[PDB]
Amino acid sequence: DMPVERILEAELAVEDPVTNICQAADKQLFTLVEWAKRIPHFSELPLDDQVILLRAGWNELLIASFSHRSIAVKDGILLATGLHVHRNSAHSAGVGAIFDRVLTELVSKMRDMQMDKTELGCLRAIVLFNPDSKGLSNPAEVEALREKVYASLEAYCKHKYPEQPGRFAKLLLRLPALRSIGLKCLEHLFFFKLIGDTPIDTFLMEMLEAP
């Protein structure tokens, strides 16, 4: 089984600007590992596959988390360090475009639909169990777990928001945006690493290593 209550529990258990964002990201990578261990069946996968899923998903997973954390923030994001970062600050640091995509495609859409923590948890678990991740010893097994998450999520939405028949599809359709922003985020991080002005801490650095 894949009970949405366990997924919610996982979320609840873990609850210039470029430098601050990068520092916050490094910090949250530790927390991400703890989150993943709390998702049903993840820790039962082979260690090598747990590594692959987390290396494949970490940036989307962190982006989804700070985006949902920021739904009551006007034109900004709330980092896990407690720091609010506004649009103007990101623009003045040369990362306005990517920052605005986060705000318009993720944060404001999460706000508009009042995406809840169960739904966020499920989307994150779907991202985690990515069966397209290269090198998985058993892709079908990860595919099975993803299928169980989205079954439970659809059941949850239909029970909790029966007057919103499109809500489930609406949730899933933020995933392409999440993927694209995740990819653009990586491009920036690789550049910061290349230029070498911004400090990149050890876990974030490791995520930027070749496989």
Partner: peptide, 10 residues
């Protein structure tokens, strides 16, 4: 990927 392995191990 030494950090991730160490943290997942437990």
């Amino acid at each position: 990927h030494k950090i991730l392995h160490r943290l997942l191990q437990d």
